[PDB]
Amino acid sequence: SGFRKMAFPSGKVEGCMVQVTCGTTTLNGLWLDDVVYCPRHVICTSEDMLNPNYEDLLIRKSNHNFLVQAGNVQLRVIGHSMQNCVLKLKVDTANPKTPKYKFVRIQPGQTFSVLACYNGSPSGVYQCAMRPNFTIKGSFLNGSCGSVGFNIDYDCVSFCYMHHMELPTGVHAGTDLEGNFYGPFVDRQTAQAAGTDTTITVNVLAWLYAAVINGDRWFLNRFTTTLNDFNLVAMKYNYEPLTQDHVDILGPLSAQTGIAVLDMCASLKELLQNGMNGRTILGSALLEDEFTPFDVVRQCSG
Amino acid sequence: SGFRKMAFPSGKVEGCMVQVTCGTTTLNGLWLDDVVYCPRHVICTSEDMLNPNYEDLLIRKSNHNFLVQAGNVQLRVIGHSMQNCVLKLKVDTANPKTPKYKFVRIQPGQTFSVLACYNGSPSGVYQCAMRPNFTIKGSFLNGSCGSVGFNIDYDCVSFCYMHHMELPTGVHAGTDLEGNFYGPFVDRQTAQAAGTDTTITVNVLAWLYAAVINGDRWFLNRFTTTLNDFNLVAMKYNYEPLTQDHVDILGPLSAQTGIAVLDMCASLKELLQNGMNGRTILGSALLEDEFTPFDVVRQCSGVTF
Numbered sequence: 001s002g003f004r005k006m007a008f009p010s011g012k013v014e015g016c017m018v019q020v021t022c023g024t025t026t027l028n029g030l031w032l033d034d035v036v037y038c039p040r041h042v043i044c045t046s047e048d049m050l051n052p053n054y055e056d057l058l059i060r061k062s063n064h065n066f067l068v069q070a071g072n073v074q075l076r077v078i079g080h081s082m083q084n085c086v087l088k089l090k091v092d093t094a095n096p097k098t099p100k101y102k103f104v105r106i107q108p109g110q111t112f113s114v115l116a117c118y119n120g121s122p123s124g125v126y127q128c129a130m131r132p133n134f135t136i137k138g139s140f141l142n143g144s145c146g147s148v149g150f151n152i153d154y155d156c157v158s159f160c161y162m163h164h165m166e167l168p169t170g171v172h173a174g175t176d177l178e179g180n181f182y183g184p185f186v187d188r189q190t191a192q193a194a195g196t197d198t199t200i201t202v203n204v205l206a207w208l209y210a211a212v213i214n215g216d217r218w219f220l221n222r223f224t225t226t227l228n229d230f231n232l233v234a235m236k237y238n239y240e241p242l243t244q245d246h247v248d249i250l251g252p253l254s255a256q257t258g259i260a261v262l263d264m265c266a267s268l269k270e271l272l273q274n275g276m277n278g279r280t281i282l283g284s285a286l287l288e289d290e291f292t293p294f295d296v297v298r299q300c301s302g
Numbered sequence: 303s304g305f306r307k308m309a310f311p312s313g314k315v316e317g318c319m320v321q322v323t324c325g326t327t328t329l330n331g332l333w334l335d336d337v338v339y340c341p342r343h344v345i346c347t348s349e350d351m352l353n354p355n356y357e358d359l360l361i362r363k364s365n366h367n368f369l370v371q372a373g374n375v376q377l378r379v380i381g382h383s384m385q386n387c388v389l390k391l392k393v394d395t396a397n398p399k400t401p402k403y404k405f406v407r408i409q410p411g412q413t414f415s416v417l418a419c420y421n422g423s424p425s426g427v428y429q430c431a432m433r434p435n436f437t438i439k440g441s442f443l444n445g446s447c448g449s450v451g452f453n454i455d456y457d458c459v460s461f462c463y464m465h466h467m468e469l470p471t472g473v474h475a476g477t478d479l480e481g482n483f484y485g486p487f488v489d490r491q492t493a494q495a496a497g498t499d500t501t502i503t504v505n506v507l508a509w510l511y512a513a514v515i516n517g518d519r520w521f522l523n524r525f526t527t528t529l530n531d532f533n534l535v536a537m538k539y540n541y542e543p544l545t546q547d548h549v550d551i552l553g554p555l556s557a558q559t560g561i562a563v564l565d566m567c568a569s570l571k572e573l574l575q576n577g578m579n580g581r582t583i584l585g586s587a588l589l590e591d592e593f594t595p596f597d598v599v600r601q602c603s604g605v606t607f
């Protein structure tokens with residue numbers, strides 16, 4: 001019993017964190033085999049922030065301009081290349097602590113763990129979700145750039161995010177490990193704003209199924225809804241549309257608890273109308289949307 | 303910016319997790335140097351768990367009855383002893399991944415990270431607080447026994463908790479690494495219930511300071527209060543009494559934000575009597591009490607390990 005926001009054990013990722021210095025800028029890098037991955041904005045001089053020409057700034061660099069530090073050991077850079085918004089620094093030592101890994105690009109609503117780092121040193125681990133507006137509500141300070149997001153299903157680490165910047169509203173933007181940004185963002189200090197954020201409907205439903213599995217049934221009702229009627233109500237509360245894929249995904253949880261997806265949808269419609277009336281669901285007074293259907297099956301059933 | 307429930311990096315602890323099997327029971331052990339620590343209830347059976355004489359049960363067991371598995375390697379047990387509610391299994395191999403460590407006993411209100419394991423394999427890390435009633439609101443299933451709680455200070459791991467059981471309300475009970483239970487609990491199948499819980503006042507105040515640091519100021523007011531008047535209000539809402547030590551501890555946060563501790567207490571008093579009125583603080587509609595004043599400073603400064 002119990003339901004906590006849980007992060008993956010960070011050990012396999014801690015053994016990959018290094019410090020990357022170029023000029024006056026110091027940020028984090030991810031050392032896998034003989035390559036160190038880091039945000040390409042490590043080559044920028046702040047005056048190269050409104051309109052940097054990264055190809056022009058990178059052509060002027062040599063291998064010895066990048067100082068890479070793994071613990072108390074300096075790594076020698078023997079090559080460098082840019083792939084989208086990530087800089088790939090070839091080094092002369094393969095990381096002996098390199099775990100089994102993959103680079104995965106995630107979709108909004110997906111969750112992952114973040115190992116927040118400063119000067120190549122891990123300071124904390126927390127659970128996150130990719131918001132529908134492609135931002136992440138993280139906990140980051142200056143020097144956290146290059147900190148990574150990951151999932152560890154089995155013994156394989158799937159790297160899905162690399163932190164690049166903070167938006168004016170306090171939310172964070174970044175890329176996958178191939179350098180492609182999530183959302184309409186660019187690694188430039190230009191006027192950029194996160195789009196209006198919405199609640200991840202499929203995740204709230206999964207969390208209501210976790211509450212039922214843990215014995216909380218107070219919010220259930222005798223009603224059902226059509227998918228169309230639910231979406232017309234949901235849109236008015238800034239909830240993401242629920243698709244037939246989401247309904248299919250919730251199938252195992254519906255079978256385990258005996259509550260049809262569209263019946264659980266009718267309970268959510270009512271919770272949005274009534275509020276909680278001083279009550280809580282799984283220790284929360286708000287509807288939680290950072291647990292996916294997969295997270296619920298993993299944490300509630302092993 | 304941002305304020306998340308954050309746990310310590312778990313790597314130094316992952317390298318210590320092993321599986322311990324005795325008879326039909328499998329749970330987790332902590333391998334430090336040449337000793338494996340685990341709950342003593344790993345030696346219990348069906349009727350033994352009802353009313354157990356653990357010295358009588360341990361005498362019947364020999365070293366080869368304890369199967370210890372570190373990854374895909376079996377460790378050989380060369381001795382065994384009991385210290386309070388923890389079993390200490392002497393092994394032939396010293397853990398080469400043993401970090402710098404200490405065994406510390408924590409006080410209610412203090413927080414720690416828990417590395418939840420099943421069959422000696424870590425599956426998750428989460429942050430939590432020792433409740434004033436000595437329970438933890440954790441997330442555990444069968445096989446999680448022996449999972450540990452810890453804090454990291456520079457490069458030293460302070461082990462403070464070992465999971466032993468789940469109470470009927472879904473909350474958890476365990477011991478420090480010396481086998482002493484937190485709370486009035488015993489390690490056996492019997493009628494046990496967690497006492498009435500209270501809110502950790504110093505932690506709520508620290509979390510209100512974190513909200514101010516992150517730009518949330520709506521709850522602030524022009525008023526201040528006395529420590530006595532605040533505690534008379536706090537006792538009414540099942541909040542732990544706030545001591546002069548708590549006030550002293552919140553000092554750095556008071557200086558950084560310009561909000562005196564009794565000035566923030568007046569904000570907390572108004573919040574308890576009037577509610578949030580549809581508003582949230584750091585994305586929460588409830589008053590959060592699982593961040594200590596040190597957690598707030600550490601997260602709002604970027605301390606690394």
Ligand SMILES: O=C(Nc1cncc2ccccc12)[C@@H]1CN(S(=O)(=O)c2ncc[nH]2)Cc2ccc(Cl)cc21
Nearest residue numbers: 041046140141142144145164165166187188189303
């Ligand atoms: O924002 C960034 N990184 C951070 C990362 N995470 C959380 C932060 C919290 C607080 C401060 C920074 C944070 C960096 C640096 N900043 S900055 O601080 O405004 C700055 N301007 C001049 C020197 N430093 C501009 C910027 C612009 C574009 C890009 Cl791609 C990265 C970045």
Ligand SMILES: O=C(Nc1cncc2ccccc12)[C@@H]1CN(S(=O)(=O)c2ncc[nH]2)Cc2ccc(Cl)cc21
Nearest residue numbers: 001343442443444446447466467468488489490491
């Ligand atoms: O509760 C305990 N551990 C657990 C640990 N964490 C979360 C659990 C969730 C769900 C089930 C157990 C959980 C154990 C197990 N049992 S039990 O459920 O009745 C049981 N009987 C046979 C197998 N399992 C009571 C018990 C009594 C005394 C002691 Cl010290 C430990 C314990």
Ligand SMILES: [Cl-]
Nearest residue numbers: 105106107110
């Ligand atoms: Cl995905």
